[PDB]
Structure formats: structure tokens, C-alpha cells
Design a protein around this ligand. Structure first.
Ligand SMILES: Nc1ncnc2c1ncn2[C@@H]1O[C@H](COP(=O)(O)OP(=O)(O)OP(=O)(O)O)[C@@H](O)[C@H]1O
Ligand SMILES: Nc1ncnc2c1ncn2[C@@H]1O[C@H](COP(=O)(O)OP(=O)(O)OP(=O)(O)O)[C@@H](O)[C@H]1O
Ligand SMILES: Nc1ncnc2c1ncn2[C@@H]1O[C@H](COP(=O)(O)OP(=O)(O)O)[C@@H](O)[C@H]1O
Ligand SMILES: [Mg+2]
Ligand SMILES: [Mg+2]
Ligand SMILES: [Mg+2]
Lengths: 471, 478, 471
């Protein structure tokens, strides 16, 4: 008999016993369908994912929903396949949960539609694409210092409340409307308010006809938060493989994946690792990240927000993620509290496209010079704080004077930021940004006030502000 | 036909517990009914702990397990040169089968103390700072350590490229890297032509932990095959930190008692066993050599973590890369102060020896004076001269990416700097001075370059002074 | 008759089961010898040391070599004694491993030779002898500021690449030249390259055949790396106790001894102590360091090189070796860079033999004045760094002038420094040292330039170099 019985329930983990010789293989799905026998019970419709074999014909599983109401001895049904997600032209314009069911209240999905399993092996070495070309976004810091790479992996590190989600919304507003391909958004452990707002915004902009949304969320149990990303990734993989279209893959807070893994790992019988994380942190993250790539069949470029716990950049979860990205941006609360947005760290942020062959000799030189001046300004800060600006030599006077204006000019007014301020946003081309930074480094604007540079676009707007106020 | 057979008890997280297998050896290679391989690391009283070398989703409780009675081997030969291979030896670049014959055990004794010979010949990297201040010899082990994005991979790539003339084989081992990054590295090597004498071993992040754990040993076995034939090999390990993370994962999943930072008690044993196999064989054994360049990544400069200390204690010297130097325009970012090289002096040609001694003192004086610049300026003529010399030294020890420099040109520019010929050049123009001096040396001073390249010694200082003066008479300053 | 049986193999740790009432004692040596039965077996010749009694006739042991090839159920022969090594005049001129097996390829030790146990209690309080007599060594800094005591323990401290190994080699050469005694070198945690260089240097110098060498190379297991030191110690104790000689111990590095101890403890499963060290660090260190003492029949002096991780002197290994020493010597990267070998810090270096009643009133006065002048120079340097030396008073300028001479005179050229520089070495008597330092301080060599004092030897050579330079 291909049926099982419930043995143990401990939070989000359930142990099931099967008849000898008929155990389900790892990653298969189990279904519990129960109707209340009497008034001291509740109806249950829940799904489980196999995770371990304990021996003695016992299987330890993870629950995708709340386990309230589970009674020892409940019957478990085996499906024989992993979680299968509906995929194809069907998913365009729809919103899904972890299990692939539509939650947009716009009707069900026919039961004979093609659907693929969540779990698959990663692509191999011989299939990957390697051409590096620049994607322009209209953000001054990103286009200048850490250019984004088309067809590559991009991460936006940051702490709590620093601008990480607003930056993603700005990138959507600038890129998603002109992609031509398909954009897939998978929200992992984020605010349902944010999900609703983004859904309504994309619907109003009308780009909803070429996007799919999967929405696991902060409210759901660790199983859902652990599999929602893969549910979105399988749709992205289908669009890459079977049609060859260019795909945008926006993932919000991929950190929640490892957090849910860490939540469950204690109850799975594993010994804890260095900082209380699971011992399998690195391989589990690799088996997910290595599927988000570009092959000869089609291109996928992905943008992943990465939460940083307690602003410790040396935490294992952020530390292991760094090797999986081509271009990264670090946001800093120190810059955020100074009123300088998007608060991008100009020294920690890196990109593989910053080379004289890709961006150009002039761009490369200007970016390196800006980094050099900012490093020198960082260096001088301690003696400035101790014994004042007075003792700086004439060289350091000029260094600080240029560096403060450069740092302020790195700020920008966003289109999405208009709901917080009265200023409409700006889109700045790379050539204009290079010209403006070269001019600042050249000494033209040495007389303007510092605050003239805050939250503007092209360097002309700085002079217009310095004419509106003062002279 | 029958073999020794067990039966699986538990499966999970890439670990399989087996019951039975009475006569299995420790470390013996073991295969399941699914056709995937394993390795017996735990030999307990009633069960055996097996590490799985492949996809374990096909393994279930009750499947039988079979012995093989073999230790893991890797294919070795000249055929691997130009290929990208798995830690097990299978190709991954898709260029077809690899037709080798010989095999080597992955675990073998290192050369004895009696079999070695003292390191006495150099390894030219083409990086002026390394070849001048932190020399590397054949048969040496140099640690390269730094935070992320400091240039560690770039140094190794330059060193591999620069070995185009010397009859030395290169091996690049990628541990825990992303497959796209590995492919980019392979294409970068192909562009400059290093694939004609290089073997790339790759163990991506998506592979199971045992492969990442074993990859350096496969690399060093392929190296030792060439070493014992009289050749010279350069082995590069890309992240021993990532290897140690994989081994910690395995140790924790097998429930072995943990040490500090949850690391297993024998991680130092593992690393020492891996690194003590680089050597300089005596002429009785053929005179071959194998040098290793391990990498260790540190979090925000903490060199006092467990793995950094373990690796620092083992190797002959260390090279330190720092972001403070990297972003201040000083790249490559070798901190010449912290970096050490014990073999150094016997790994440097006499011409470079004559100048590096003065270069060290010139750098050290400037590094001592720099800490007080905030209080006292124009203190005396001595400090003014020291600061000018140090600034020009720093400007000299700076070079761009993928542009190696021959040793004769390196020693000539260092001699020109250290004798004072640059003391009348503005500090902003030293780079262009170096470029134009290289062009002039190629065009006219070929006799001096040939003398250095032939006799490993400086030319007579009258002719060299004549050449430098002749170049300076035509150099234009802006 | 009884034989063990291998039950568990967990890496370098092995469990063996014996018959009831016939268990081996703690620290006894067990031998595993197994010619392969068939093609699926590998020959084994291995030894183990007993660590714990687990009960149920079980013994927890630690391996002294690689455990690969072991099969559960092999036969173990109990030797009924701790590890035993050959001693006597046989050991001279030879190179051994941890077990006492020669590795020099010169032949095997005859089986009739006497062997002594590795483990034995320290000499009792009754039989100690406590007279102080100075150990001349021919090095200016050592003989002046940190004199050595015959029969005492000396520690050398410093970071990587500073000169500890070369300094030990120079001590070996100088002492074996000017005293002609017996010495033992123990390479705890030996590097193979350094061991080969040291052995060929011994052959070249002819010091060998007056010394014995034990090597624990790094690729050996921690059990062997920990017992190498005791092997060397018992080989030296034979020459002390039996033949009534005076012996020198040279220990390669104690930091590696402590590292091996912590690794062994972690493998055995004990809870880590502060910063992950073994709980029994103090007891293991005391057990090693107590047996190195002088008694009526003879004396054993030992020179130990210590590695300090990241310049941190609060690390448990140096902090616990500080308790046992009679003299200390701090080697500095900063002095090494300035071209000053042996790079000894003249201020950190302290000794208990620097007393007026032991070395002499004139020696004590000279050393005290040298230390005072050097410290005064150190303080003035930072005043100069902010206020020019043209501002300083005349007497302090005299102090600076003389301190330059003293600092550069503390340096010396060594015998083993020929392989690095070509300049032949020197040996300087203590009276020559004290008289040379009484001058200079008196003012006899103020007109000589500072560059004539570096790496010089006796004072007359300073004048010789000055004459060679025309000054
Ligand atoms: N470019 C900007 N212009 C103006 N205000 C900004 C900008 N970026 C961020 N902010 C401010 O910082 C806040 C951060 O919002 P956001 O949701 O993007 O942060 P977050 O990093 O995702 O935080 P959380 O961890 O709470 O999700 C914004 O609501 C806004 O008040
Ligand atoms: N000498 C140099 N001149 C200019 N750019 C350099 C130089 N050395 C390295 N870089 C650049 O610095 C960046 C990071 O260097 P690299 O990737 O080699 O360092 P890494 O420490 O190995 O990094 P990762 O941790 O990402 O593997 C690259 O964009 C590289 O091109
Ligand atoms: N007296 C000396 N003269 C010249 N060089 C020395 C001297 N002592 C040490 N060195 C330098 O130190 C290096 C060896 O250092 P080592 O003794 O191994 O230090 P450590 O043992 O602390 O690592 C040699 O390559 C040599 O260049
Ligand atoms: Mg957010
Ligand atoms: Mg790299
Ligand atoms: Mg040493």
C-alpha cells in the first residue's frame, strides 16, 4: 500500500512512516487531505516535501503551510514527483504562490497544462555564454563606477531601511518597460503591502502582459519561503530554454531563502555551524545560484536584493553570496543618514565591466580618479576630526574640497522618489555623467556651494540650482 | 559472481550511512546500486559513513551497496594539457575523450627530506613588486592572502601567462568558483595562449562537497606526474578557504566533534598534507620542481582567523593584498611591509640582488616617515629627500593589468630609479618615463639587455650611465 | 597471550578492543602489522598510542601515521611499554623520526641497543641543583643585555621571517665551536625544506657527529607532531643522567607543539578552552618543560623558538611559555628591515642573569647605561617628528649621536650569514663586548660615521672600516 502515517509533528517538520520498500525519494511531494471526523478536529489540506530518510521506513518532511491541527496517525498520500509548477504562455500576467496555484482571483488553470518540476540539475560548463556588454540604467553611480552587465548576475547588498527596494523599483521603471523579452518577479520573504503596490503599479503601467509574479512572503512558513524562489526560477528557465527570449529575473531578498533554511536546519538533526547557520549553507546556495545563468539558447539577467543582518557584511550568508555575482552594489546606512541617496558605497561596489576595453579609456580613467580622491578623503577624516581642517596642506585642502562635491554629486533624484518629495526624477546618460565628473575633477566648479549638487541629474542642473539660490 | 555488499540505513544532505561491508578499508571507493560512487570516511562499529560523489537523489533506504577494493585515482599524462577537467578527471569543455594511460593515487607520500635539494632558481612572475621585494623560487610555496576583489586571481593569471618562455607547466585549480567565472578565465588564458601549457581543474559551487574537498589533491597529483619526470610545474589553488568550508560541511554532517569555529580537528592535518608535497627534487631524482600558490580570503582583513593562521604557518612566505592600497591607485596592492619570503635571495638573479637591497631601505624610510606627515612638514633636507625618493619608488612599483615585464627591463628600471636618475623628474610623469625608457631600451640599448640576459649580471656602470644619460637628454617632460 | 581488535576508525583516531583483564596501560605503544591477504587489501605497518580507557574492554588510541587502509577487525600487538627510542653514542650523527627509526638512509639501529621510555616523571625537588653560571655565546646583544644561563631555558619570540631559525643555527655553530659538548636538535613541526637545508648545513660545517636530530615534519599526524619533542628530550636526558655530561636542547618551534596538542584534544572530543585551545595546555607544557633541569650528574639547557601570531603576546601558547623561561629575546620585523641583524629588540629582551652579583659590577653598569640611552633616544624621536632636531638641547643631541652608534654596534655578522651576503662571520668575547660598549659611551668614537658600525664584530674592525672609507 502506497500510503503513510504521521508519526511526529515538531513545528514545521513532520515525520511519516511508510510500508517497507515503498518510501518516497527525496524532494517528492506528499499530500494530506483530511475532513473532520468529529467536532474536536479541523479540516486539513496541506502539502509536504521529503527531505531525509531516517531509516526504519521513516521519512522526515517539511511543511509548506501551517501545521495546526495535525494528529498522529493521519494518512499521507504520495504523489511520486516533486512540486510541479505550471509553465508556458499561461503564466504571463498571473500571480502564483509557492505551489503554482494562481492567487490573483482570476480563475483557475486547466489541469492538463504543461508543468515542470522545481528541481533540476544546473547547466554545464560547455553551454555558458561569456560575452560582457554594458546595460545602462540612468543612475549616475551605477553607470560610472560599477556598470551593470547584460546577461549577468547583479546583487544589491544593504541593511534595513537603506533604499534597497526603491532602487529595484527604479531599475524596473527604467529597464522593464523597454526589454521586449519577459520579466519574472519572485518575492521571497517580503512585505505583502509591497507586493500589492508593485502589482498595481505594473498593472497601471501595462507591462503586466509580459510578466509573471510568484509571491511567497514574510507571513508564510519556512517551506514556502524556501521554495518560492525555485518556483519562479523554473518559469524563468522555461522561457530561457524553450523559446530563447531575453528574461529579466527580479528577486527580492534572496537572503530569506538561507534564513528559512537556517530556521528548519535545527529540527532536521544537523549540527550547527559557525554562527548558528546550517552546515549545508554553501552547497544549498550554490545549487540555487548556479541555475541563474545565461546559455547559448537564451540569456537571463537577474537582480537580487540581499539583506545584510545587523549590518555585518562579514556574516556567512552575505560573505558566501559575493562569489556568485558579476556586479555588486553595497548600500550604507552611514551614507543614508547623511541625506545622500541612493546611498551607494563608492568604494565597496565593484563590477567586472569596469575595464578600459569595455567602458573606454576616458570613462575608466575618470572612474579610477574619482575612487582615488574618495579614498584620500576617507583617509584624512580622522585627523580632520581630531585637529580640524586647519592643518591640512594645500594639496589636502583641494582634495577635500573636490571630494565633498563629488560625493554630493553622486546623489540623484529618482522617479520613484517623487512619492516622498516634490522633485520629479531624472535619467542621465553615461556620456553626460562622464563629462560631468570629468569637469568636476577638472576644477571648473570650484566656487559653487556644496549643497547645490544634491539630488540633481546633469551637471547643468547644478549650475541652475546655484543660480536659483545665491549666485 | 559476488562481492562484499552492504545496505543503506540513512540518506540525507549528501551523506549515506550503510550497514554491513565488513571488510571495507578506510577511504575505499564504494559504489551504490544507482551507479554513483562513494567514499568511506567513517568506520564505526555497526555502520559505515559514506560520502557521496554524485547526485544523491537516486539513493533510497534499502538499496544495496557494493565494495570495489580500490583507492581513488586520477588520469595523468601529456594529453590533459590544454583541457579543462573534473576533479575525477572527466572533461567538461566538451572537446571529446581524453586518451591517457597512467593513473596516480590521490593520496601519496611527499618527497622525503633526503630527496630534496635547496631552492636556488627563480620563478619569474613579471610583477615588479613581487620579483623585487618578495621573490619566489621553484619548489617554493607562497601564500597570497587578501580581502575580496584585491587582485588575487589577476596575480595568478599574470604569473601563468609570463611562463610562456620557461619550460614550465601550469595548473590552475578552481575551487568553489562559479562556472561562468571559470569559463571567463579559460577564455582569458586562451587569448594570450597559456592553454598550450596549462591544465585547468574545476570544481564549481553546484557540485557535491566531496569534489570541492578533493580537487586540490587531483591537481597536485597531475602536477607530481610531471614533476617526477624532470619537468617543472606551477600549481595554483584558488580558495583553500572554500575547500575548508566544504570539509567542515562534511565533518559536521558526519557528526564528528567540532573544534574552534566549528572546524574539524584535522583541518590543519589536511592542509599540511596538501602543501608539503611541493618540492625541489635533487638531481639524483631528476631535478624537477613543483611550486604551489595557495589563496586564502580574509573577512575585512582579519588575518587571525583559524584557516588564515593555519595556512600562514605552513607556507614559506606570504603576499598581502589590501583594499586601502588598491583603491588609492597603488595596484598591484602588495603591502611590501607585511609581505615576507624566506627563500628570497637564492631565488633572485645577481643583477636583481644588487638593486633590491637598496630598494628595500628606500621603501622602509618612506614608510616610517609617512606616519608623521600630519604634524611635521619641511622638517629637514633629509626627510625631504627621503619623501621624494619614496614617492618615486612607489610610482615605479606600479603596473597595469595583463602586461608582464621581463627581468632585464625590471632590473634596468629599478637600477635607474635607485641610482637617482629619476630625482629630477616630476612624480606625476614616472609612468610615462618608464614606458619611453622601455621603448628606448628596445630600440638602442640591445647590447645591455643581451648582456643581462646572458650573464645574469649588470652591465658595466659606465655604459649603463651613458645609456641612461642619452635617454634623459631626449626625454621630454610635461 | 592477548591481541587487540580494531573496532572503529575515525580518521587519525582508532579504537581497539582487548580481552578482559589484559588491557594495555595508558601511553603504551600498539603495533599494527598486516601483510595484504588479497588484491582488495593493502599492507599496513603502523603504530598507535593509548589515550583513554573507554570501558567495556575498549581503548581509545591516537595514530602516529596515516590510517588509510585499516579494516575493522585487524590484529593489534601490545608492546607493554610506552614508545621507546634508542639512546647512547649510537644516536650521534643520525636523523630520526618520532619513533626512533632513522631516516638518514645510513642504516638501521641494531636490535640489541638500549632503548628508553618516552614518558617518565620529572626529577624530584630533592635532586635539583641551583647554581648560576653564564653561558657565553659570542653574540653582542645576547652577552650584553640578555645573558644566557647554563642549565636554564631561553625563549626566542617573533613573527614570520624575522630570523629565529638562522639565530638558532648560529647558536649551534658558535657553541659547538667554543665548548665542544653534546647537543640535540628537535624539529617539532619541521618544514621539509628547512630540515633539508639544516641537515646539509650540518654536513658542511662538521658540527654533526656531535649532535642528534629528530624531525617531526608537518605532513605527519598530530600525535607524532606532539611526541617528537619528548623523543628529543629523552635522547638528551640519556646524555645528562647516564654519562654525566652537559647537553643543549634546540627546539624548532613550541607554537606547533601547542597546536598539535589542541588538535589532538579536539580529535579526542574534549571541550575547547579559551580561544579553542586544549584544556590541558598548562599541564602538557609543564610536563615538557619540567624535565629540562640541571641536577648533580649534569645540566640540560634548552633554546626554544616561539612564533607569535599577528604580534599578539596574549595568545595562550606564548602566554603559557612565558612562565618557564629564564631569559627572553624579542626579534623585530622593524629592526630586520633596517638591515640590522639579528634584529633583537634591545629593550624588550630581558634576563634574570643581568644582576650585579652574577655577571659583574662593570658589566651591569654598562648594560644599564646602554639601556637608558636607547630608551631616551626612543622617546626623543617622536618629539623630533613634530619639532625639528635643530630645536633640541645640546645634551640630548649628544644622546642621539651616541645612540646611533650603540644601536648600529649591537648588530653583528654571522657564520651562517655567508650564504646570504658573502661576508664571513665573527665571534666576540664578553669582555670585548663590555669594553667596546664602555667606549663609544665614553665618547671615544664620536667622529666616526654611523655606517662604519654596522655588522662589524670587535670594535677594532669599526676603525678598520673607517680607515678603508678614508674617514
Ligand atoms: N532614492 C531615494 N530617495 C529618497 N528617499 C529614499 C531613496 N532611497 C531610499 N529612500 C528612503 O529610504 C526608505 C527605504 O525604503 P526601501 O523599502 O527601499 O528600503 P529597504 O532597504 O528595502 O528596507 P527594508 O529592509 O525595510 O525592506 C524609503 O522608504 C525612503 O524613505
Ligand atoms: N593591476 C591591476 N590593474 C587594474 N585592474 C586590476 C589590477 N589587478 C586587478 N584588477 C581588477 O580588479 C578587479 C578584481 O580583481 P581580481 O578579480 O583579480 O581579484 P580577486 O581577489 O581574485 O577577486 P574575487 O574575490 O572576486 O575572485 C578586476 O576587475 C580586475 O580586472
Ligand atoms: N644575519 C643575517 N644576515 C642576513 N640575512 C638574514 C640574517 N638572519 C636572517 N636573515 C634573513 O632571514 C631569512 C630566514 O629567516 P628565518 O630565520 O627563517 O626567520 P624565521 O625562522 O623567524 O621565519 C633569510 O632568507 C635571510 O635573508
Ligand atoms: Mg526592502
Ligand atoms: Mg578572483
Ligand atoms: Mg623558522
Amino acid at each position: 500500500m502506497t500510503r503513510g502515517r504521521v508519526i511526529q509533528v515538531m513545528g514545521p517538520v513532520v515525520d511519516v512512516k511508510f510500508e517497507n520498500g515503498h518510501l518516497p525519494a527525496i524532494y517528492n511531494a506528499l499530500k494530506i487531505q483530511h475532513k473532520a471526523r468529529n467536532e474536536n478536529e479541523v479540516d486539513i489540506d496541506l502539502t509536504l516535501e521529503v527531505a531525509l530518510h531516517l531509516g526504519d521506513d521513516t521519512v522526515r518532511t517539511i511543511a509548506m503551510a501551517s501545521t495546526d491541527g495535525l494528529i498522529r496517525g493521519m494518512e499521507v498520500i504520495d504523489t511520486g514527483a516533486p512540486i510541479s509548477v505550471p509553465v508556458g504562455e499561461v503564466t504571463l500576467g498571473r500571480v502564483f504562490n509557492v505551489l503554482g496555484e494562481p492567487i490573483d482571483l482570476e480563475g483557475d488553470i486547466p489541469a492538463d497544462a504543461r508543468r515542470d518540476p522545481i528541481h533540476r540539475p544546473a547547466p554545464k560548463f560547455e553551454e555558458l555564454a561569456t560575452e560582457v556588454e554594458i546595460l545602462e540604467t540612468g543612475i549616475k553611480v551605477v553607470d560610472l563606477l560599477a556598470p551593470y552587465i547584460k546577461g549577468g548576475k547583479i546583487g544589491l547588498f544593504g541593511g534595513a531601511g537603506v533604499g534597497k527596494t526603491v532602487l529595484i523599483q527604479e531599475l524596473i521603471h527604467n529597464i522593464a518597460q523597454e526589454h521586449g523579452g519577459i520579466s519574472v518577479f519572485a518575492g521571497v520573504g517580503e512585505r505583502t503591502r509591497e507586493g500589492n503596490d508593485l502589482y498595481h503599479e505594473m498593472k497601471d503601467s501595462g507591462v503586466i502582459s509580459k510578466t509573471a509574479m510568484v509571491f511567497g512572503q514574510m507571513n508564510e512558513p519556512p517551506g514556502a519561503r524556501m521554495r518560492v524562489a525555485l518556483t519562479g526560477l523554473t518559469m524563468a528557465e522555461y522561457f530561457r530554454d524553450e523559446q530563447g527570449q531575453d528574461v529579466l529575473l527580479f528577486i527580492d531578498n534572496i537572503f530569506r531563502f538561507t534564513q528559512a533554511g537556517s530556521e528548519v536546519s535545527a529540527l532536521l538533526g544537523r549540527m550547527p555551524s559557525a554562527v548558528g547557520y546550517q552546515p549545508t549553507l554553501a552547497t544549498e546556495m550554490g545549487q540555487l545560484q548556479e541555475r541563474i545563468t545565461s546559455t547559448a539558447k537564451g540569456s537571463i539577467t537577474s537582480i537580487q536584493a540581499i539583506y545584510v543582518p545587523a549590518d555585518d557584511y562579514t556574516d556567512p550568508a552575505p560573505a558566501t553570496t559575493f562569489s556568485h555575482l558579476d556586479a555588486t552594489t553595497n548600500l550604507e546606512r552611514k551614507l543614508a543618514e547623511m541625506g545622500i541617496y541612493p546611498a551607494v558605497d563608492p568604494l565597496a561596489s565593484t563590477s567586472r565591466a569596469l575595464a578600459p576595453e569595455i567602458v573606454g579609456e576616458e570613462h575608466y580613467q575618470v572612474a579610477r580618479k574619482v575612487q582615488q580622491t574618495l579614498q584620500r578623503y576617507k583617509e584624512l577624516q580622522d585627523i580632520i576630526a581630531i585637529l580640524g581642517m586647519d592643518e591640512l596642506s594645500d594639496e589636502d585642502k583641494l582634495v577635500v574640497h573636490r571630494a565633498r562635491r563629488i560625493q554630493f554629486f553622486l546623489s540623484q533624484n529618482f522617479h520613484v522618489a517623487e512619492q516622498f518629495t516634490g522633485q520629479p526624477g531624472s535619467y542621465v546618460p553615461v556620456k553626460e555623467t562622464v563629462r560631468g565628473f570629468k569637469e568636476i575633477l577638472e576644477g571648473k566648479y570650484d566656487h559653487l556651494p556644496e549643497d547645490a549638487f544634491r539630488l540633481v541629474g546633469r551637471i547643468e542642473e547644478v549650475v541652475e540650482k546655484a543660480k536659483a539660490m545665491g549666485v | 559472481q559476488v562481492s562484499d555488499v552492504g545496505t543503506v540505513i540513512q540518506v540525507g544532505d549528501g551523506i549515506a550511512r550503510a550497514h554491513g561491508l565488513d571488510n571495507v578499508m578506510s577511504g575505499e571507493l564504494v559504489e551504490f546500486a544507482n551507479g554513483v560512487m562513494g567514499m568511506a570516511l567513517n568506520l564505526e562499529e555497526n555502520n559505515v559513513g559514506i560520502v557521496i560523489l554524485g547526485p544523491y537523489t537516486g539513493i533510497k533506504e534499502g538499496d544495496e551497496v557494493r565494495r570495489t577494493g580500490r583507492i581513488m585515482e586520477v588520469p595523468v599524462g601529456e594529453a590533459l594539457i590544454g583541457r579543462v577537467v573534473n576533479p575525477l578527471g572527466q572533461p567538461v569543455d566538451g572537446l571529446g575523450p581524453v586518451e591517457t594511460t597512467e593513473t596516480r593515487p590521490i593520496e601519496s607520500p611527499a618527497p622525503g627530506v633526503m630527496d630534496r635539494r635547496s631552492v636556488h632558481e627563480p620563478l619569474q612572475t613579471g610583477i615588479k613588486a613581487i620579483d623585487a621585494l618578495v621573490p619566489i623560487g621553484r619548489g617554493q610555496r607562497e601564500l597570497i592572502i587578501g580581502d575580496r576583489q584585491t587582485g588575487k586571481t589577476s596575480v595568478a593569471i599574470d604569473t601563468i601567462i609570463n611562463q610562456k618562455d620557461q619550460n614550465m607547466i601550469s595548473i590552475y585549480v578552481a575551487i568553489g568558483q562559479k562556472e561562468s567565472t571559470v569559463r571567463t578565465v579559460v577564455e582569458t588564458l586562451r587569448k594570450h595562449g597559456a592553454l598550450d601549457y596549462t591544465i585547468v581543474v574545476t570544481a564549481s559551487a553546484s557540485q557535491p562537497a566531496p569534489l570541492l574537498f578533493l580537487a586540490p589533491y587531483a591537481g597536485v597529483a597531475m602536477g607530481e606526474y610531471f614533476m617526477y619526470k624532470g619537468k617543472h610545474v606551477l600549481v595554483v589553488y584558488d580558495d583553500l578557504s572554500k575547500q575548508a568550508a566544504a570539509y567542515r560541511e562534511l565533518s559536521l554532517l558526519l557528526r564528528r566533534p567540532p573544534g574552534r569555529e566549528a572546524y574539524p580537528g584535522d583541518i590543519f592535518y589536511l592542509h599540511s598534507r596538501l602543501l608539503e608535497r611541493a618540492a625541489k627534487l635533487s638531481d639524483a631524482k631528476g631535478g624537477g620542481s613543483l611550486t604551489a600558490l595557495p589563496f586564502v580570503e580574509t573577512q575585512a582583513g582579519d588575518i587571525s582567523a583559524y584557516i588564515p593562521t593555519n595556512v600562514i604557518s605552513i607556507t614559506d612566505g606570504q603576499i598581502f593584498l589590501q583594499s586601502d592600497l588598491f583603491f588609492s591607485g597603488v595596484r598591484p596592492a602588495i603591502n611590501a611591509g607585511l609581505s615576507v619570503s624566506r627563500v628570497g635571495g637564492a631565488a633572485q638573479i645577481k643583477a636583481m640582488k644588487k638593486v633590491a637591497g637598496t630598494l628595500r631601505l628606500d621603501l622602509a624610510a618612506y614608510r616610517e616617515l609617512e606616519a608623521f606627515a600630519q604634524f611635521g612638514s619641511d622638517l629637514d633636507k633629509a626627510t625631504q629627500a627621503k619623501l621624494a625618493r619614496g614617492a618615486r619608488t612607489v610610482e615605479v612599483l606600479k603596473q597595469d593589468l595583463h602586461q608582464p615585464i621581463p627581468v632585464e627591463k625590471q632590473v634596468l628600471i629599478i637600477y635607474a630609479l635607485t641610482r637617482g636618475f629619476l630625482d629630477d623628474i616630476p612624480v606625476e610623469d614616472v609612468r610615462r618615463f618608464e614606458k619611453e625608457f622601455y621603448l628606448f631600451l628596445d630600440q638602442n640599448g640591445q647590447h645591455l639587455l643581451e648582456h643581462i640576459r646572458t650573464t645574469k649580471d649588470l652591465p658595466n656602470e659606465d655604459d649603463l650611465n651613458k645609456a641612461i644619460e642619452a635617454f634623459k637628454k631626449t626625454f621630454v617632460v610635461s
